[PDB]
Each structure stands twice: as C-alpha cells, then as structure tokens.
Amino acid sequence: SLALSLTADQMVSALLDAEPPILYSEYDPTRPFSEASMMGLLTNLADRELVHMINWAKRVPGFVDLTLHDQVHLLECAWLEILMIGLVWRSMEHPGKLLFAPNLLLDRNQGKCVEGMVEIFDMLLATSSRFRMMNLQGEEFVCLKSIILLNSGVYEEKDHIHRVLDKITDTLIHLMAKAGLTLQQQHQRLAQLLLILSHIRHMSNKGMEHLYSMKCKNVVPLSDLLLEMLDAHRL
C-alpha cells in the first residue's frame, strides 16, 4: 500500500514519468478519406495506444495493488475515456481540430466521412476548447487521467481505490495551491475539472455505441484486443 505514502510532488513526478508517447497513424495521403479508411485509421491507432495504456496503468500508484480481475475490469471500463482525454489534451493548441496523431490532424468536416461521427467530433472539440479556456496544465491532465482509470468502474478493495482517489484529489489541490490560487478558487477549479470527467464519460459511451455500430456495419475488421474491450461494454 506504498502509493499511500507518496507526497503530492512524488505523485505528480510519478505520473509525468509514466506518460505514454504520442503515436503516429498509418495515414496514407494517396488514399481519399472513405468511411472504411478513416474508421481504419482511428481503430488502428487505438489498438497501438492500448498496449502503451496497459503498461502506463501498471504505473499509476496503487493500480497493481488490486487483483488482476479488478485491474482488467477498470481498463475495460475506462479505455476509450483515457484515449479520448488523451486526444483532447493533444488537441488543445489546435483550435477547431482533433490531433489524433501528428500526421492525422482532423477537423469537424471529416467526421462527416463517417455517419454519426460528426456529433462525436463536436463533443471532443468542445472539450478541447474547455481545457483551453481553463488553461489545463500537464500536471492536472495526468491526475485526471489517473482518476478516470480508478473511477470509471470502481465496482477494503474498493476502499483502497477510494483512498488512492483521495490521494489524487489532494495532489490536484496541491498543484492549485502551488499555482497561487485562493482556497475558494481551488475548490471551484477542482469542481470544474471533475465536471469535465462527466462529459468525457458521455463521449466514451457515445463512441462505444458508435464503435459497436461500425462493427455491425462491417466497416472495418477490428483487432482481437478491440473486439474484447467492445464485448466487455456489452455483457
């Protein structure tokens, strides 16, 4: 239970260290955006990020203290929320665009390539603007990503998880106190950040039913990893 001993600064340092890299898509220009090709690009990218996610999780303090079964359940619940908050974050300096990868910068117009995708792109773009408005910092972003992981399926064992969650809240508050925010302003900012998580949950649920829909339309073959995560949100 040694994650419960870290200072606020050790926690931030630990999460910043565990950050996965930004990956490249296999976008090929000489190949107009179809529904299949873009669905192909997005899901290929998700597949590859998934392996980096699994390993990052193992490095969120307190995550390995849970049984393999709980760990599985949390990543199954959280995986698209995590990819999405990742995307939103990367997309912050690109107003009106989603930077899925350095070589895949999309705007709301090409969400249209895929039925129902545009409503999702708009939600993602709206969350990116919010981050930008609030001037979300990297240290905050990594705390939020760890909360998504531990929160989104927290169902002793889930008291340990609630101890770890409290530790991360403490860490966000520490970060804001450090930034020179008044107590009042600290509470307000903390609530603004955690209320974003509700929108990210919404987007994940929307993306998961879109994803499931795309598989029934046979738009693209999906990874065995991806098929498993998808069948976890439906049984």
């Binding site: 392996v51 699994i54 599985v72 990543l75 199954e76 990893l225 498993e228 995560m229």
Partner: peptide, 9 residues
C-alpha cells in the same frame, strides 16, 4: 482474455 494476459507480462 487478451487484456488479462497483457497485464500479466
């Protein structure tokens, strides 16, 4: 389950 195997490694 593929995830199960990946967490193990």
């Amino acid at each position: 389950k593929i995830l199960h195997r990946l967490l193990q490694d």
